[PDB]
Chains A and B, each alone.
Chain A
Amino acid sequence: GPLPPGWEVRSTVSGRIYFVDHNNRTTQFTDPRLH
């Protein structure tokens, strides 16, 4: 699957996608790939 190596992808038991980016150190509930 095509995914930039900076995008550390994790999924919450709530059924939510949640990002943790290694460069900016950011946590986003918004997935840019899902749209």
Chain B
Amino acid sequence: ELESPPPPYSRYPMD
């Protein structure tokens, strides 16, 4: 990945 920590798995992500 080499990227920053990804967004914690929320079931239904609304952003």
Give A residues with C-beta under 8 Å from B: 8, 10-13, 16, 18-22, 25-30
Q: Is the CB of A18 within 8 A of B7?
A: yes
The size of the chain B interface, using a CB distance under 8 A, is 11
Evaluate contact between A29 and B6: CB separation under 8 angstroms.
yes
Question: Beyond the given A19-B6, A20-B11, A27-B7, could you list 16 further A-B residue pairs with CB under 8 A, ordered by the A residue number?
Answer: A8-B11, A10-B13, A10-B15, A11-B15, A12-B7, A12-B15, A13-B15, A20-B10, A20-B13, A21-B9, A22-B11, A27-B8, A27-B9, A28-B1, A28-B6, A29-B1
Q: Which of B1, B9, B10, B12: most chain A CB closer than 10 A? A: B9
